[PDB]
Amino acid sequence: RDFNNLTKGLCTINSWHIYGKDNAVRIGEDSDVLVTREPYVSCDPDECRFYALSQGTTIRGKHSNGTIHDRSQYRALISWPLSSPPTVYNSRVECIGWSSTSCHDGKTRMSICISGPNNNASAVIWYNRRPVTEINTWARNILRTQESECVCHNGVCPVVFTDGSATGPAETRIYYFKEGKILKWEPLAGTAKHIEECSCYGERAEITCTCRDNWQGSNRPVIRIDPVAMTHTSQYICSPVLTDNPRPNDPTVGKCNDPYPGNNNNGVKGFSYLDGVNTWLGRTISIASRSGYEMLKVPNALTDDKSKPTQGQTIVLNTDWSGYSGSFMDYWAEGECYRACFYVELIRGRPKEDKVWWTSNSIVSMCSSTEFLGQWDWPDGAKIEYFL
Amino acid sequence: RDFNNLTKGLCTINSWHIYGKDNAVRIGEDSDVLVTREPYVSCDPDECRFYALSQGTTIRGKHSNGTIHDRSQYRALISWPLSSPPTVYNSRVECIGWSSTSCHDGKTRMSICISGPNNNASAVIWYNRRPVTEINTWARNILRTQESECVCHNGVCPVVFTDGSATGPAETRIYYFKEGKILKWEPLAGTAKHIEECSCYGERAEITCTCRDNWQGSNRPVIRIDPVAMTHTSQYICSPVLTDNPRPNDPTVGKCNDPYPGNNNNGVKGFSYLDGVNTWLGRTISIASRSGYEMLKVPNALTDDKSKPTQGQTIVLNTDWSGYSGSFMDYWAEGECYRACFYVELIRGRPKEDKVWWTSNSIVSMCSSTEFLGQWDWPDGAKIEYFL
Amino acid sequence: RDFNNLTKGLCTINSWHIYGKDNAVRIGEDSDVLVTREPYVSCDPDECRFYALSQGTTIRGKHSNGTIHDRSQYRALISWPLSSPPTVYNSRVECIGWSSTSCHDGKTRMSICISGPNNNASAVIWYNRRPVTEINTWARNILRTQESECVCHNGVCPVVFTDGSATGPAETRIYYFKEGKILKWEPLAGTAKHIEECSCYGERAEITCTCRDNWQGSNRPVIRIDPVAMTHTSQYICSPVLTDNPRPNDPTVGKCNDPYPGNNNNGVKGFSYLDGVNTWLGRTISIASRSGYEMLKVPNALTDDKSKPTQGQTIVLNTDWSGYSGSFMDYWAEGECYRACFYVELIRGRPKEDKVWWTSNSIVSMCSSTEFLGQWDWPDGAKIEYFL
Amino acid sequence: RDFNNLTKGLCTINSWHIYGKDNAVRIGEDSDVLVTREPYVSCDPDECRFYALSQGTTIRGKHSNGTIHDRSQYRALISWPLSSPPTVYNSRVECIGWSSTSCHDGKTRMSICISGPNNNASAVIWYNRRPVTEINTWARNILRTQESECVCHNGVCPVVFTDGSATGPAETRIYYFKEGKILKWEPLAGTAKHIEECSCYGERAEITCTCRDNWQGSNRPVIRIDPVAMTHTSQYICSPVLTDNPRPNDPTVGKCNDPYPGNNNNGVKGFSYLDGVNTWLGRTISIASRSGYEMLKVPNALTDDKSKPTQGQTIVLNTDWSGYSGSFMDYWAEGECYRACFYVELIRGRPKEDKVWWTSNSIVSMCSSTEFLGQWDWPDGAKIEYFL
C-alpha cells in the first residue's frame, strides 16, 4: 500500500443520496446497543465504518441513567460496520476517552482519543492499532479535538485540537502527524477567534475544515491546511446563511473575518463543502435547538458576504431531532472525483426528551449525486414512549 | 477474477431438495432477530447468503408494531449467512431503502436500493460496496424493482424497474449495468401489459425473468433478455396452470400474449424455470390467499396454451402461510449444468394473523435434484400464541 | 491442499485430558443458545469445531417446548467454535435435516444431512459448502446416519447409513464418497445384525467404526473399512465389558459374531478405540439409563471374548446425566501419531428431567495423553430449578 | 514468521497512559457478558487481546450465584478483542481449566490451562490451538500457574508453576517450553521462599517475573530467567515500599533475601518493572484489602533496601475496588524499545459486595509514556444496586 494523495477535486454536487442509516435507537429498544454520542463515518481502502463515543452501557441498561454527561471514564471511541447499530458484540474499540478523531492514510489507520479530568487531560495517538505518541494538556482546560475524521496526504494527517475556555480565547493547535508521530505543530493563525470540533475534507492537496466558534460566532470558522508545507490559514464563512446553532436569524450580509454575533457560549459541530459555485452548507433548520437538518447550495459562501441559497435539500424535518454533523469522503473510490459525504447525529433523550434518563443517538449519512434526486426526510424513528 | 459468463444450461429437474431454512420467526421469539419481508437468496463465488428488507426493529421490539407497512425510512437491504436468521448482530447492510435487487458479476457485487416518498423515489446502485450511480423516479409513482437477485453475463447485469400505477399501465424500464454504471436502458417491449417484481435466472447467454402483472393478469408475464445485444422480449406464460395469487381457478386454455383475467389490482412475486420439457412453475396452493406452495412440472408452459402438469412437489401445505417466491442459482458451482433454486417467503403476522401487531417472515429454499426425491412440507414453524 | 491420507497409527493412550467443554445449558439459561442434541466434534486442517443438530429455537424460547422430538422441519446441522456454546449468532448452518455426518478430506469439507417424513426421507451431500449429490430412501423407514464425523483417505470418505426397522433387520449401506460424488456403495456384510449411529476413526489406511445394534445387542457392532479397496467387514466387540445402554450386567464371556442379549429395541450411540493392547472402550456407568460415563482400557476387546479392564478413567459421575458419545481425531496435528479423542453429550431436560418442557445438551470432549493424568469428572453443571 | 527475540530494552517510563478498559460489569448488567476473574492481556504479532478465566455463566444468569469459588469444571481460559467485554458471542476459548498462562512466540501461541480436583490436577499445554503436552500434579495440592502472560525468546517460553501448600513450603518449578514441548524444567532456586502467580516481562534476553509469596512475604519475590541458558535466580524486591496485599505499613528498610513479615497466608497477584532508576512498582493503596491501585517510581527497588518513591501515579482511587494486576508488553510494536504495560483486575461482588451472589471483574490497562502525563482514576464504574 502507498500513502493516499489528495489528487482529485470534488464531484459536482447536484443533490444528496442516502448512504447509510443505523436506526440504532429503534433497534436498541430491544437489543444490546451501546449508548453513544459524537458519531462520525470514516473509510479505509476496503471498507467504510461508523464511529462514535460509547458511554460504556447499553441503552436499556440501568447504567444509561446519566448519559447526558460528556466525559466519564466509561467512554471509548468505537467503530462498527456501516449502517449496523453500535452493539456490544460488533463494536471495535479504537481507544479510550471522551474526545476523538480517526483517519486512514492509505497504509493504516491513526486514531486519537483524549481522556482525563478537565485540568489534566491527555491525547494518545494510535497508529496501526498500537499507541505511538502521547500529548499532555497545554492549557489545563478540557483538551479536545474534532469528533469526526481527519484527512491525510502523503502520510501527513493534520488534526486540530483546542485546550482552554469554551467562552473566551482558547489555545488551538494544528498537529501534523505521520505514522502516529508528531512532525510539527502550529498555533492557530488567521482571523478565526475560537475553534472547536473541526469537520474536514481534502481535495487537490488542500484540507478544508469547518469548525465551531463556541464563544461568539454563529457563522462558522474555516481552517484551510496545506499538508505539504504544513501551514494553514483561518477565516469565517462570509455568507449570511448562518450555520451554527443556536443562532440569530439570517441577515443580508455576513462576516468574513470575525464572528457574526447574537449568540454566545454555545454551538454545535457542523460542516460545509466550500468549492466555488459547488458550495453546500449544512445546518439545523431551527435557530434555537438541534432540530431539523438541511443542505443549502450557497455559491461562493466562503468568500461572498451576501451569498444566498440557489438550491437545497431537506435531510431531517424541523419536527425531528438532529445533532452534530460532519464531513467524510471515500478517498479510495473509483472514478475521477471525490464524492462529498456527511453524517447527521440524531440525538434522542436528554435534554430535549427528559422522560427518559439517557442520551443517545442514531446516524444518518448521505453522499452527493450528479443527478437532481428527489428528497426524503430521515428521522431517527424511535418512539420515546416505548422506553418508559 | 473474470466476469462470469452464462455458459451452461439448466440441470434436469426431477425433484427439489432442501437447500436452506432459517426458522427466523421461531428463533426470534427469544433472540434479537430483525423484522423483515421481501427476502431472497444470492450467491457470490465463495458463499451464498440470505437477503431481505429489514424493518429496522427486532420482532420482540416495540417498534415491530406497524411493520405491515411497505416503505419507511427504517428499511434496508441486509444480507446474512445462509440458513442463519437475520439478526441484529450478523446482518450486513447492503444499502438503504424499501425495494431492492443484488447480484454478483464474478468480480464483485452490485446492490440496488430505492428509497424516498412515493412521488420522489430514487435508486442508488452500489458496486464493490460503494455507491456509483443514482436514478431518479421517471413517473413519480413508487419507483420499484425485483425484490430478488439480478443476473450478470460478461459484466452486464440487466435489472427490471417499474415506476407508475399498480392498477393500470406503468413505465417499466430494463437497465443494463456494468461496474454499477448504466450502459443502456430500454422501455418494456412485447406483449406483457404490466410488470413488477421480476424473478430472473440465466442459462446459455439468455436471462429469463418471470414477473407479476399486478393490474390484470393471473398468468405471469415473462421477459427474456439478451445481455450481449442488450435487447429483450416479453410475453406471458401460455399455460392454463395459472401462477399468480389471488387468481381464478385454472382453465383449460391460457393466454400467451395478454393477461388471463378474473383478478385485478393484486398479485404476489413468483417465479418459474422455462426450459422446454424441463419446465417447472411455482405457485401458492390457495387461489385466494398467500397460503401453501407447490412446484408443478408443466412441459412447454411458456409456449403451450393447453399445457398441464406431469409431476409436482408440495413445498408448503395449504394450511401454512407462504408469500413471495423467487429464483436464484449458484453460478459458481462445479459441474456441467446450473442447478435451479428458489426460495419461498413464509409470512407471519399481519394481515392474516392480526393478534400480533407485526408482519415478518422466515425463509425456506430448495434446489433441483436429478433424483426423484421424497417430499416433505416446510412450514415457518412458529406459534403465534407465544407472541401474545 | 492435498487429500489427507491416514498414514499414522494411534498414539499410546495412558489417560485422557480435557479438550473442550461448552457449558451450553448453564450459559443458555440467560443467553441466546440454541436447543440441540446429537452433537459431535470434527476438525478442518486449521480449526476444530463443535457440531450438533439444532432444534431451531433457543432454550429459553417458548419454542423449546416439545424438543424431546427427534425429527422436525426446524432442525439443522450447525457448527460453532470449539468450546463456545451453540448460539444464534455464532452457529453456522451446514445443511438442513435431522440426521447428519461431516468430515474434511484435507481439501474441503463434506457434510450430509437427511430430512423428510419417515417414509420419504432423503440425504443431501454437500461438498465445499454446496449441494452435490442426493440419495432417496431405499427402505422408506427413517433413512439415518452416523451423528458423528466421517473419515477420509485420499479423498475417499466412507459413510454408514441405515434405512429400515429399529427393532428388526434393516438395510445398512456403506457409501464411498469423493468430492461429494458416489464412487460406490455396498450393503452391510459380516456378522453385525443391526447397525446405527457409527462412530469412526482412521489409522494406517483403515477406518474403524463402532456402532449401535438397536435391535438386540448390548455389545457393540464394529465395521472396519478399507477406503482404498472400498470394502468392509463387520463383527461385534468380543469383550464381556458391554458398552451399549440400557444393557444387562457384564458377563464373563462376550460374543464376537452375534448380539449379546438381554436388552431389545433400544441403545445409545457410543464409540471405542480398538488397537490391540491400546484398546479403550467408552460406556455409560448405569446399565439402565444414560447416566455417568467412563473409559475402560480393555486389551484386545475386539478379539478376546474374556477381556476385562486393566485401567480406567471416570469422565462423568453416575449421579450426572450423559448421552451420546463418539470419536474424532485431529488428523492435521503435528507429530508421529494420531491422538484419539471423543466427546460425550450431556443431555438435560426430557425425559429424565421433566419439570422442564425441553430437551437439550452440552458437550464435554477429551483427548488421549501418554501421561497417566489425574482424573476429574465433568458434569453439564446447570441447575434445572433455575429454568422453572 | 521467525521466533521473537527479546532484543530491546524498556522504554523510559515517565508516566502511564490509558491503553484499554472494558467496562464489563457496567455493560453486563444488560448484555450477555460472562462472569470472569483472573484476567490479563497478551499480544500476538497482529493483535492484542484481553484474557481471563470464565466461570461458564453470564453475570445476570442464575448460575452466577456461587462464582466467588475458584476452581469448578465450568471455567475456561477465554480471550476477546481488546477493550470489548468478554461476551458469550465474542469470547474464544483457549483451553479448559481454572489456572492459566498464554504467550505468543512470534510464530504462534502457547496456552496452558490446569484443571482437576485439588489432589489430582493436570496442565495441558496447547500450541497453535492444539494440545501438545500434558503435566500431572507433582505435589497433589492445587497445581497452579501465573494467571498472566508468559514470555518467549527464540522459541523458548519459560513458565512458572507451583504445586503444594499455600501456607508453607511448596514445590515451584520453572518449565522451559518450545513449540509446546518440554525442553527442561528446574526446581526453584535462590532466596524466594514461596512463589505464586508470577507476572513476567522480557527485555535484552532476560525475563523478569514478580510473584506472590502467599506464605510469609509482603515484599514480592522476583525470579529472573535466562531463556538461552535456561537458568534462573530468585530473590525479593529489597525496597521498603511493600507491594503485596494485605501487608503491614511500609518500614524504612526492606528485605532482599527473605519475606518481609507481618502478614501470613494471603496475598494478591501483582507486578513490577525493575530497570535501575527506571523502576516502577504497582500496589493496592489499601494495606488491608484489594482497594485502590497506584504506580510508584522506586529507583533501584530490586537492590536498594532503603529505596523510596520519587514519583507516582494513581490508577484506581482507594474508594474503588481493585484486584490482581500483571505485566505484558507488545513485543511486536515499532520503535527502539519495549513499552511497559500492565492491567488491573477491578473485582466486583463477593466477598466485599455481598448483596449480590456473584464475583466478577472488569479490566483497566495502561502502558508507559515518555511524557509526564496528567493522571485520572479508572474505576470499574458499575452500580451494585442495579443488580439487586
Ligand SMILES: *[C@@H]1O[C@H](CO)[C@@H](O[C@@H]2O[C@H](CO)[C@@H](O[C@@H]3O[C@H](CO[C@H]4O[C@H](CO[C@H]5O[C@H](CO)[C@@H](O)[C@H](O)[C@@H]5O)[C@@H](O)[C@H](O[C@H]5O[C@H](CO)[C@@H](O)[C@H](O)[C@@H]5O)[C@@H]4O)[C@@H](O)[C@H](O[C@H]4O[C@H](CO)[C@@H](O)[C@H](O)[C@@H]4O[C@H]4O[C@H](CO)[C@@H](O)[C@H](O)[C@@H]4O[C@H]4O[C@H](CO)[C@@H](O)[C@H](O)[C@@H]4O)[C@@H]3O)[C@H](O)[C@H]2NC(C)=O)[C@H](O)[C@H]1NC(C)=O
Ligand atoms: C421532489 O424532490 C425535489 C428535489 O429535492 C424537490 O425540489 C426541491 O424543492 C426544495 C423545496 O422547494 C428546494 O429547496 C429550496 O431551494 C431554495 C432555492 O431555490 C429557489 O431560489 C433560487 C434562487 O432564486 C434567486 O436567485 C435566482 C438566481 O438568480 C433568481 O433567478 C431568483 O429570482 C432569486 O433572486 C431559484 O433559482 C429557484 O428556482 C429554481 O428552482 C425551482 C424549484 O425549487 C423552480 O420552480 C424554478 O423554476 C427554478 O428552476 C428557487 O426559486 C431555497 O431558498 C430553500 O431554502 C430556504 O427555504 C427553506 C424552507 O423551505 C429554509 O428551510 C431554508 O433555510 C431557506 O430559507 C431560509 O434561509 C434563507 C437564506 O438566508 C432566507 O432568505 C429565508 O427567509 C429562510 O430563512 C428563515 O429560515 C431559516 C431556517 O429556519 C432561519 O435560519 C432564518 O433565520 C429565517 O427564519 C430550499 O432549500 C430544492 O432546491 C428543490 N430542488 C430541485 C432540484 O428542484 C421537489 O419539490 C420534490 N417534489 C415534490 C412533489 O415534493
Ligand SMILES: *[C@@H]1O[C@H](CO)[C@@H](O[C@@H]2O[C@H](CO)[C@@H](O[C@@H]3O[C@H](CO[C@H]4O[C@H](CO[C@H]5O[C@H](CO)[C@@H](O)[C@H](O)[C@@H]5O)[C@@H](O)[C@H](O[C@H]5O[C@H](CO)[C@@H](O)[C@H](O)[C@@H]5O)[C@@H]4O)[C@@H](O)[C@H](O[C@H]4O[C@H](CO)[C@@H](O)[C@H](O)[C@@H]4O[C@H]4O[C@H](CO)[C@@H](O)[C@H](O)[C@@H]4O[C@H]4O[C@H](CO)[C@@H](O)[C@H](O)[C@@H]4O)[C@@H]3O)[C@H](O)[C@H]2NC(C)=O)[C@H](O)[C@H]1NC(C)=O
Ligand atoms: C413420496 O414422495 C414422492 C415424491 O414427491 C411422492 O410422489 C409424488 O406424489 C405427488 C402427489 O401425488 C405427485 O404430485 C402430483 O403430480 C400430478 C401429476 O402426475 C399425475 O399426472 C400425470 C399426468 O397424467 C396425464 O398425462 C399423462 C401423460 O400423458 C397421461 O398418461 C395421463 O392419463 C393424464 O392425461 C401422470 O403421468 C402421473 O402418473 C405417474 O406418476 C404417478 C405418481 O404420482 C404414478 O402412480 C403413475 O404410474 C405414473 O408414473 C400422475 O397421475 C399433479 O397433477 C398434481 O398436481 C395437481 O394436484 C395437486 C393436489 O394434489 C394440486 O395442488 C395441483 O395444483 C394440481 O392440481 C390442480 O391443478 C391442475 C392443473 O390445472 C388441475 O387439473 C387440478 O384440478 C387442480 O386444480 C385445482 O387446484 C388448484 C390448486 O389449488 C387450483 O389453482 C385450481 O383452480 C383448482 O381448484 C401433483 O403435483 C408427484 O408428481 C409424485 N412424484 C413422483 C416422482 O412420483 C409420493 O407420493 C410420496 N410417498 C408417500 C407414501 O407419501
Ligand SMILES: *[C@@H]1O[C@H](CO)[C@@H](O[C@@H]2O[C@H](CO)[C@@H](O[C@@H]3O[C@H](CO[C@H]4O[C@H](CO[C@H]5O[C@H](CO)[C@@H](O)[C@H](O)[C@@H]5O)[C@@H](O)[C@H](O[C@H]5O[C@H](CO)[C@@H](O)[C@H](O)[C@@H]5O)[C@@H]4O)[C@@H](O)[C@H](O[C@H]4O[C@H](CO)[C@@H](O)[C@H](O)[C@@H]4O[C@H]4O[C@H](CO)[C@@H](O)[C@H](O)[C@@H]4O[C@H]4O[C@H](CO)[C@@H](O)[C@H](O)[C@@H]4O)[C@@H]3O)[C@H](O)[C@H]2NC(C)=O)[C@H](O)[C@H]1NC(C)=O
Ligand atoms: C488420581 O487420578 C488417578 C488417575 O485417574 C486415579 O487412579 C485411577 O483410579 C481408578 C479408580 O480406582 C482406576 O480405574 C479403575 O481401574 C480398574 C482397573 O485396575 C485394577 O485392575 C487391574 C487389573 O487387575 C487384574 O489383572 C491384573 C493384570 O494381570 C492382575 O494383576 C490382577 O490381579 C487382576 O486379575 C490392576 O492391574 C490394577 O492395579 C494397578 O493399578 C492400581 C491403581 O488403580 C494400583 O493400586 C495397583 O498397584 C496396580 O498398579 C487395578 O487393581 C477398573 O477395573 C475399574 O473399573 C471397574 O470399576 C469401576 C468402579 O470403580 C466401574 O465403574 C467399572 O465399570 C469397572 O467395574 C465394572 O466392570 C467390571 C468389568 O466387567 C466388573 O468386573 C465390575 O464388577 C464392575 O461391573 C459392575 O459395574 C458396571 C458399571 O456400572 C456394570 O456395567 C456391571 O454390570 C456391574 O454392575 C476402574 O476403571 C484407574 O485405572 C486409576 N488409574 C491409574 C493410572 O492408576 C487415582 O485414584 C486418583 N487419586 C485420588 C487420590 O483420587
Ligand SMILES: *[C@@H]1O[C@H](CO)[C@@H](O[C@@H]2O[C@H](CO)[C@@H](O[C@@H]3O[C@H](CO[C@H]4O[C@H](CO[C@H]5O[C@H](CO)[C@@H](O)[C@H](O)[C@@H]5O)[C@@H](O)[C@H](O[C@H]5O[C@H](CO)[C@@H](O)[C@H](O)[C@@H]5O)[C@@H]4O)[C@@H](O)[C@H](O[C@H]4O[C@H](CO)[C@@H](O)[C@H](O)[C@@H]4O[C@H]4O[C@H](CO)[C@@H](O)[C@H](O)[C@@H]4O[C@H]4O[C@H](CO)[C@@H](O)[C@H](O)[C@@H]4O)[C@@H]3O)[C@H](O)[C@H]2NC(C)=O)[C@H](O)[C@H]1NC(C)=O
Ligand atoms: C496532574 O497530573 C500530574 C501527573 O500525575 C499530577 O502530578 C503528580 O502528583 C502526584 C500526587 O502528588 C505525584 O505522586 C506522588 O509522588 C510522590 C513522590 O514525589 C515527591 O517526592 C519526591 C521525592 O522527594 C524525596 O527525594 C527527593 C530526591 O532527592 C528530595 O528532593 C526530597 O526532599 C525527598 O527526600 C520529590 O522529588 C517530588 O518533588 C517533585 O515533584 C513535585 C510534584 O509531585 C514537585 O512539586 C516538586 O517541585 C518536585 O519536582 C515530590 O515531593 C510519592 O511520594 C507519592 O506517593 C506517596 O503518597 C501517596 C499518597 O499521596 C501514597 O498513596 C503512596 O503510597 C506514597 O506514600 C506512601 O508510601 C510512602 C513510601 O513508603 C510513605 O513514605 C508514605 O508515608 C505513604 O505510606 C502510607 O501509605 C501507604 C499507601 O496506602 C501505606 O502502604 C503505608 O504503610 C503508609 O500508610 C505520590 O506517588 C506524582 O509524582 C506527580 N507527577 C508529576 C510528574 O509531577 C498533578 O498533581 C496533577 N494536577 C492536578 C492539578 O491535579
Ligand SMILES: CC(=O)N[C@H]1[C@H]([C@H](O)[C@H](O)CO)OC(C(=O)O)=C[C@@H]1NC(=N)N
Ligand atoms: C415498493 C413496494 O412497496 N412494493 C410492495 C409491493 C407493491 O405494493 C405491489 O407490487 C404493487 O405495486 O407489494 C407488496 C406485497 O406484499 O404485495 C410488497 C412490496 N413491498 C416492498 N417492496 N417494500
Ligand SMILES: CC(=O)N[C@H]1[C@H]([C@H](O)[C@H](O)CO)OC(C(=O)O)=C[C@@H]1NC(=N)N
Ligand atoms: C433419525 C432419528 O430420529 N434418530 C434418533 C435415534 C433413533 O430413534 C434410534 O437410533 C432408533 O432407530 O435415537 C435417538 C436416541 O436418543 O436414542 C436419537 C436420534 N435422533 C436424531 N438423530 N434426530
Ligand SMILES: CC(=O)N[C@H]1[C@H]([C@H](O)[C@H](O)CO)OC(C(=O)O)=C[C@@H]1NC(=N)N
Ligand atoms: C488455583 C487457584 O485456585 N488460585 C487462586 C489463588 C490461590 O488460592 C492462592 O494463590 C493461594 O494458593 O487465589 C486467588 C485469590 O483471589 O486470592 C485466586 C485464584 N483463583 C484461580 N486461579 N482460579
Ligand SMILES: [Ca+2]
Ligand atoms: Ca457558536
Ligand SMILES: [Ca+2]
Ligand atoms: Ca396479478
Ligand SMILES: [Ca+2]
Ligand atoms: Ca437478551
Ligand SMILES: [Ca+2]
Ligand atoms: Ca442395543
Ligand SMILES: [Ca+2]
Ligand atoms: Ca503475601
